[PDB]
Amino acid sequence: MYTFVVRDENSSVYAEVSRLLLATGQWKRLRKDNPRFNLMLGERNRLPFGRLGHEPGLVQLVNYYRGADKLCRKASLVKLIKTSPELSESCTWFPESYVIYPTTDEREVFLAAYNRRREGREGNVWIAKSSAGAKGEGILISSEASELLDFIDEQGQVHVIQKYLEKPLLLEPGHRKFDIRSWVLVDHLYNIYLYREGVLRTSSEPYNSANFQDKTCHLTNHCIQKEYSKNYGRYEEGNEMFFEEFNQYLMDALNTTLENSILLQIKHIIRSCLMCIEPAISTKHLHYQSFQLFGFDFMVDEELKVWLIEVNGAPACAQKLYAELCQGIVDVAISSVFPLADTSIFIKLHH
Amino acid sequence: MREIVHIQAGQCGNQIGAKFWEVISDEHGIDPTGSYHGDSDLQLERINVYYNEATGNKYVPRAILVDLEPGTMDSVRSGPFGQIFRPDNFVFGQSGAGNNWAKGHYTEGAELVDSVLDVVRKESESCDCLQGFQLTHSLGGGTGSGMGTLLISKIREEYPDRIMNTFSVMPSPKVSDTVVEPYNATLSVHQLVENTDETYCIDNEALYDICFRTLKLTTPTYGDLNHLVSATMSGVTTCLRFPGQLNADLRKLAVNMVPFPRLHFFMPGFAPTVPELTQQMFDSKNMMAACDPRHGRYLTVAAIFRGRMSMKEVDEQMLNVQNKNSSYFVEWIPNNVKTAVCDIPPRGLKMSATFIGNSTAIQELFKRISEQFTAMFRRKAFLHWYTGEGMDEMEFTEAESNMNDLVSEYQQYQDATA
Amino acid sequence: MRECISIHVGQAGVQIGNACWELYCLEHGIQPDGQMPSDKTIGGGDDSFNTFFSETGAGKHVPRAVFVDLEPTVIDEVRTGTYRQLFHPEQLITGKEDAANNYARGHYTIGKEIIDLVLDRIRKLADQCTGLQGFLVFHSFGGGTGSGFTSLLMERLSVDYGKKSKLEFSIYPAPQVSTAVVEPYNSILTTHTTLEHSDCAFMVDNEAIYDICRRNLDIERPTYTNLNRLISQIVSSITASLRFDGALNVDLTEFQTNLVPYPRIHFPLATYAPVISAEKAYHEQLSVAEITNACFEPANQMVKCDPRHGKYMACCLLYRGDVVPKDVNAAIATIKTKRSIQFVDWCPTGFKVGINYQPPTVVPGGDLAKVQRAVCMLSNTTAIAEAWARLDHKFDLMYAKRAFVHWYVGEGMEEGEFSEAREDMAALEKDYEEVGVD
Amino acid sequence: MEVIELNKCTSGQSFEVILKPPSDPSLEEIQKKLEAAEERRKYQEAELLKHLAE
Numbered sequence A: 001m002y003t004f005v006v007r008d009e010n011s012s013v014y015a016e017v018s019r020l021l022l023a024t025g026q027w028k029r030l031r032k033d034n035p036r037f038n039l040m041l042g043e044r045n046r047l048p049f050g051r052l053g054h055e056p057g058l059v060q061l062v063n064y065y066r067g068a069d070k071l072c073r074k075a076s077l078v079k080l081i082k083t084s085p086e087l088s089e090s091c092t093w094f095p096e097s098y099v100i101y102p103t104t105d106e107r108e109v110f111l112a113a114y115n116r117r118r119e120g121r122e123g124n125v126w127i128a129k130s131s132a133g134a135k136g137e138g139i140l141i142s143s144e145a146s147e148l149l150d151f152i153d154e155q156g157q158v159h160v161i162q163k164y165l166e167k168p169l170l171l172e173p174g175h176r177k178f179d180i181r182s183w184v185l186v187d188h189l190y191n192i193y194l195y196r197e198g199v200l201r202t203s204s205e206p207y208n209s210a211n212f213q214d215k216t217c218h219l220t221n222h223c224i225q226k227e228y229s230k231n232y233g234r235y236e237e238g239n240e241m242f243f244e245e246f247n248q249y250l251m252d253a254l255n256t257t258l259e260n261s262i263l264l265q266i267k268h269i270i271r272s273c274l275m276c277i278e279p280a281i282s283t284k285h286l287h288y289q290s291f292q293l294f295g296f297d298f299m300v301d302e303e304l305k306v307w308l309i310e311v312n313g314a315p316a317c318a319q320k321l322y323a324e325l326c327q328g329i330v331d332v333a334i335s336s337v338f339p340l341a342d343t344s345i346f347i348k349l350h351h
Numbered sequence B: 001m002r003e004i005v006h007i008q009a010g011q012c013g014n015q016i017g018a019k020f021w022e023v024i025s026d027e028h029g030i031d032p033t034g035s036y037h038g039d040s041d042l043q044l045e046r047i048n049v050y051y052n053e054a055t056g057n058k059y060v061p062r063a064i065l066v067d068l069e070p071g072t073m074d075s076v077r078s079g080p081f082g083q084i085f086r087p088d089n090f091v092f093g094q095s096g097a098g099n100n101w102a103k104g105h106y107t108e109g110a111e112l113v114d115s116v117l118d119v120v121r122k123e124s125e126s127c128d129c130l131q132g133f134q135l136t137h138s139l140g141g142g143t144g145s146g147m148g149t150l151l152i153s154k155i156r157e158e159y160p161d162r163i164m165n166t167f168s169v170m171p172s173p174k175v176s177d178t179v180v181e182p183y184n185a186t187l188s189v190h191q192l193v194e195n196t197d198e199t200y201c202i203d204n205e206a207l208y209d210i211c212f213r214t215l216k217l218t219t220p221t222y223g224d225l226n227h228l229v230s231a232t233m234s235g236v237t238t239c240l241r242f243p244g245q246l247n248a249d250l251r252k253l254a255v256n257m258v259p260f261p262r263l264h265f266f267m268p269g270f271a272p273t274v275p276e277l278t279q280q281m282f283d284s285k286n287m288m289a290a291c292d293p294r295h296g297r298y299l300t301v302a303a304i305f306r307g308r309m310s311m312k313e314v315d316e317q318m319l320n321v322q323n324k325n326s327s328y329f330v331e332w333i334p335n336n337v338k339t340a341v342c343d344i345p346p347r348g349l350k351m352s353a354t355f356i357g358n359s360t361a362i363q364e365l366f367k368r369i370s371e372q373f374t375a376m377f378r379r380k381a382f383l384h385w386y387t388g389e390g391m392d393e394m395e396f397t398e399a400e401s402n403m404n405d406l407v408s409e410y411q412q413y414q415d416a417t418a
Numbered sequence C: 001m002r003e004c005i006s007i008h009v010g011q012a013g014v015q016i017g018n019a020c021w022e023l024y025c026l027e028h029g030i031q032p033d034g035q036m037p038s039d040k041t042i043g044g045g046d047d048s049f050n051t052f053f054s055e056t057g058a059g060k061h062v063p064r065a066v067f068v069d070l071e072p073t074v075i076d077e078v079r080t081g082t083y084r085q086l087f088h089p090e091q092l093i094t095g096k097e098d099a100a101n102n103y104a105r106g107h108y109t110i111g112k113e114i115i116d117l118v119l120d121r122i123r124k125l126a127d128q129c130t131g132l133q134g135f136l137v138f139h140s141f142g143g144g145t146g147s148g149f150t151s152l153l154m155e156r157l158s159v160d161y162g163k164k165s166k167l168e169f170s171i172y173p174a175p176q177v178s179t180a181v182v183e184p185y186n187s188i189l190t191t192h193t194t195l196e197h198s199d200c201a202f203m204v205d206n207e208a209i210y211d212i213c214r215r216n217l218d219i220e221r222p223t224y225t226n227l228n229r230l231i232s233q234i235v236s237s238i239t240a241s242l243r244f245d246g247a248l249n250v251d252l253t254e255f256q257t258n259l260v261p262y263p264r265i266h267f268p269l270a271t272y273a274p275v276i277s278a279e280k281a282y283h284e285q286l287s288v289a290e291i292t293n294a295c296f297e298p299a300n301q302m303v304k305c306d307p308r309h310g311k312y313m314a315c316c317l318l319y320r321g322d323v324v325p326k327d328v329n330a331a332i333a334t335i336k337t338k339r340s341i342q343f344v345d346w347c348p349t350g351f352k353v354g355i356n357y358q359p360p361t362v363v364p365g366g367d368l369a370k371v372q373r374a375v376c377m378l379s380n381t382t383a384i385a386e387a388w389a390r391l392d393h394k395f396d397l398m399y400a401k402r403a404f405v406h407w408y409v410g411e412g413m414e415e416g417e418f419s420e421a422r423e424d425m426a427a428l429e430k431d432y433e434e435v436g437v438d
Numbered sequence D: 001m002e003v004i005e006l007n008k009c010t011s012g013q014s015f016e017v018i019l020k021p022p023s024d025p026s027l028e029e030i031q032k033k034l035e036a037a038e039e040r041r042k043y044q045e046a047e048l049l050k051h052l053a054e
């Protein structure tokens, strides 16, 4: 049989597939520091990549791509998009963003943008966020550049200012905001697998253009919704609308489909991002192999244009979908390298 | 030119050692008269390790034969390879030891010990670069145990910087023919723990089971058991006696096999497709010491394969055993299983494998002897035979304490984690 | 003409030393007896190949080399090998019993007893030198002699030849190729003691050499002969600039000025291409761009690591054979676009190139195929620190439980030296991280 | 992206290609360390022989 290790003990997704592998009866779990493993479910921070692919007679697999942080960090992502010809600074599916260092900084660049929109009386609502922000906190929306920079100085970690989508697609009934989460698996061959089932993560408070103080109607993190949202769960169970219902809503309310209006743009963004970094992280010729599951976050505006907002290299699945997705990771990302003894759920995004 | 001085003491030591010289003499192609009549020059490239080159191109073992009872000397001298040995290297008494450790260690053996060291000085001074000593002996008797460890203590005084190896037949859990063996064994172990770099634990009950249950000998004898032990002794010393990809001595073996100075008691094995040997070799049924490897963890392991065989096949099979049953290996000694190969197989065999394991499970053996020792010592049973030779009860208490401390040490690293 | 003395310490250094001097003789046409018909200047000369060879009035070209080992098994073969006539017996020093894989035994116990003799024999060769440059030291990280005695010699060389340069060719231990449980200890101790005395050190991981041999040469179980012959090719290409006319890496001092802006980070990664099996029927000749691209494939490096996740501080390309500057420059341009090559902001993104028109040489009956163009790339990338972390982690596992420490203490070392040297490696690992990671 | 420092000889030639511009102990100290180690070995051996003498 095969052997594996678990080093992210707080990983919801990989806690379950650790049980899946054992259930097969052709795998076994060693402890963190035993080096004779075929698979590693590594830690989120400072994974020891340099120690893999050196044990004689052991093909080794790891559940993380060395270098994917360049895409899953708010500061890195903005720099990666602006400096990569593939994506470029004029990228259209990524909101106008600028990296800001409190106390390689683009303060005066964003200051030239806000003033330009002041002359033309254009929308000037911006949002400041950072990877340091946790639990749905550390993010402030304002149309006053002065307020944003000041808030970023009280904070310590690097911050980024992003053009706020003042015109999001609003679901009815509710007149409410949402974001889309797509789960993407990249195997050792670097095939890009998009999970068929996504989820809309919904705000249960009508989108209020007037005041951004009430961030329950502007921030759609399930985390915050349970905290300070009265209407939680009124429409869909746990503010989680799924593709079958949303597709029906698009048909009934806008005479379109989820595939054409939105999903086609989603697949293009996923490929563009992942292909941009393939030369840097590909393990096709490495002494060890890598796979990794990502979570892409999207925003849809009223014109049914798709925007990318964040990328998660250690994402959490939806409770209803853990069983199916985790089983797919084994079939596609693990059993492919370590066959067991003698229909698809993913959408393969072509090279 | 890294010569080894062989010493064998007591019946067991001499019977086992005598069969050992028969085995390697055939491997180096040396006849009873001591003249070479072999085929390959690889038999001689490193022959000076265990043999002195005498006038007339006769080969004489660097062997010293010791006992307090002359009977076993005469058996050796009249055996198949009796006339190989140097006449002056028979150092024997007339009294015997009477299964009494004190007689062998303090009185009867003390009278004869100097004569044995004089023969050691002859052999050692005739060595280009003395490497170390190896001793074959039982621990349950009085001469090999009592006088054997006395010889070890004296050798360490003259040669403190040399390696001391021993092949010690240990008391078996159920088969015994000596009532006082727990006393003799415990007193010897406390000596071995201090003055030996490597000790191979040999158990006669396990050897008998192999001869009976496996080899299918309906009437096993000490000759059959000695053949197995000699076959293992040859397998252990294969790298010291033959050239190959490995150029290593006894000190290197000790440096890499012993992570802690007191825990130097090894568990030997022997086997008998390449996959099937490695399967046998790690089996409890093939272990020469009466301790289950599955009841512990290997600190270090050494495997030696002999005979024309696919090297890559052995490497893959060994690596499979490590990865397959990795829960029986300490995780904090990286790559603690090393393998060596020699092209020369033994007589009447095409492929063979020898096993050397430093397993924490060996504490089970020291537990047994301690409990047997305490049951007798609490009531001072048979003790008057030892105090009559001048021993004091405190010397018995010390040995009990040390072997329990040794048992305590083994349990420490059997549960240690990274 | 400035001379270069080679010192080979232990089994690995000696056996590699032979493969190197075997190849040197073929590349220069020197016969096993020491007489090369190609030489017109008898009994001396200021030729570039004299940097590694001295001349005698009889026509023998004597290598400027010293072999040293604490036991005579390995060097005895030298004394009776095909090239026995090549060195005067004095250049071959042997002890009685080895260091037994114990860094302390080779450094303290036995090193003190033989250091004076070795330095005298080195000084005998230095007296035959008019403009001695420095020393090239071949040794293993794992052996007791290779690790223990070498660190002692490097300390004394920094004393007796303070101004002179010292280069290391170090064999990094690999489980696949006959290691010992305590080699991580020896490798860390000898690095710590030798770090301040080594101007530039080229590590060679037996794992990488093993896999290259087993994959590109179709050798199921590589032997030390297979690895050493391949190792000699990389060494020869690295030292060719010293033995042939040229304007690149002509002086030992130039090696670190072109490869090492930071004193402590002096471990350049070597990559070699092409490695072709002679058993290969009629291997199609490769191109300049193809072999130059192979210099960035991790499978060709001497140390398996990922330079894409480090930063470069210097890069050199050493071509042997039919290579024109136009093809090299074209190949570089194309692969800057494809490969991930990030230099430190305080260094220029450049490549120092060198071409020697003589095609690579192959030993008769050797496993390497006679190719027409070959390249060796030397790059100081922070990714080589992956090797230190691997070694340091193994060190940590054992030292936490003090396994085998008693063997070193028994020879006169203190446990403090274990922690002192590990602390030094923790700093080296951290130094690499500051340079090569944001 | 220019070629500079080109040098040619009949044995070979060398040059550089810039794709982008940028943005010890003394002897006695040694022997004291070796002598301190020798004293430690001697003290260790003395304790052994002392215990063996007892």
Ligand SMILES: COc1cc(OC)c(Cl)c(-n2c(-c3ccccc3)cc(=O)c(C)c2-c2ccc(F)cc2)c1
Pocket: B175, B176, B177, B178, B204, B205, B206, B208, B209, B220, B221, B222, B223, B225
């Ligand atoms: C160790 O204590 C023994 C107890 C015993 O009977 C209780 C016996 Cl028979 C033997 N023994 C003897 C022997 C010894 C002393 C007097 C008479 C005969 C000769 C012989 O050739 C063999 C092979 C064995 C032997 C060894 C290990 C076993 F597991 C089983 C039998 C040994």
Ligand SMILES: Nc1nc2c(ncn2[C@@H]2O[C@H](COP(=O)(O)OP(=O)(O)OP(=O)(O)O)[C@@H](O)[C@H]2O)c(=O)[nH]1
Pocket: C009, C010, C011, C012, C013, C015, C016, C069, C070, C098, C099, C100, C101, C102, C106, C139, C140, C141, C142, C143, C144, C145, C146, C147, C171, C172, C173, C174, C177, C178, C179, C180, C183, C206, C224, C227, C228, C231
């Ligand atoms: N590439 C290569 N590596 C070798 C060779 N010989 C030994 N090694 C490596 O060296 C290590 C063993 O130490 P050695 O250098 O042989 O020992 P030593 O230098 O003679 O020192 P001692 O311990 O005294 O014998 C192992 O890790 C091997 O991988 C060789 O011929 N070629």
Ligand SMILES: Nc1ncnc2c1ncn2[C@@H]1O[C@H](COP(=O)(O)OP(=O)(O)CP(=O)(O)O)[C@@H](O)[C@H]1O
Pocket: A095, A127, A129, A130, A133, A134, A136, A139, A162, A163, A164, A165, A166, A177, A178, A179, A218, A219, A220, A221, A297, A299, A309, A310, A311, A312
């Ligand atoms: N440019 C923009 N315009 C409008 N809303 C935005 C926005 N950027 C972010 N948001 C809102 O902020 C919420 C969280 O933003 P962000 O992605 O920075 O937080 P986060 O990184 O903690 C989510 P996760 O934990 O899944 O990675 C989203 O649900 C989204 O509705």
Ligand SMILES: COc1cc2c(c(OC)c1OC)-c1ccc(OC)c(=O)cc1[C@@H](NC(C)=O)CC2
Pocket: B236, B237, B238, B239, B240, B246, B248, B249, B250, B252, B253, B254, B256, B257, B300, B301, B302, B303, B304, B335, B336, B337, B338, B339, B340, B356, C177, C178, C179, C180, C181, C182
């Ligand atoms: C007698 O000659 C031997 C000498 C040694 C070894 C050995 O077992 C294979 C021998 O044969 C019995 C040895 C065993 C211990 C180790 O593994 C834990 C190690 O790393 C070290 C090994 C040997 N090293 C190698 C690369 O085989 C050196 C010590």
Ligand SMILES: Nc1nc2c(ncn2[C@@H]2O[C@H](COP(=O)(O)OP(=O)(O)O)[C@@H](O)[C@H]2O)c(=O)[nH]1
Pocket: B009, B010, B011, B012, B013, B015, B016, B097, B098, B099, B138, B139, B140, B141, B142, B143, B144, B145, B169, B176, B177, B178, B181, B204, B222, B225, B226
């Ligand atoms: N393998 C083997 N073991 C023996 C032999 N003779 C005795 N023994 C063991 O040694 C013990 C008896 O000790 P003995 O050899 O007489 O020791 P001595 O008094 O020093 O000669 C028994 O318990 C046996 O286990 C023998 O010929 N072969």
Ligand SMILES: [Ca+2]
Pocket: B111
């Ligand atoms: Ca008397």
Ligand SMILES: [Ca+2]
Pocket: B114, B118
């Ligand atoms: Ca005397």
Ligand SMILES: [Ca+2]
Pocket: C039, C040, C041, C042, C043, C044, C045, C047, C050, C055
């Ligand atoms: Ca000349």
Ligand SMILES: [Ca+2]
Pocket: C158, C162, C196, C197, C198, D024
């Ligand atoms: Ca210096």
Ligand SMILES: [Mg+2]
Pocket: A131, A310, A311, A312
């Ligand atoms: Mg996030």
Ligand SMILES: [Mg+2]
Pocket: C010, C011, C071, C098, C143, C145
């Ligand atoms: Mg050696």
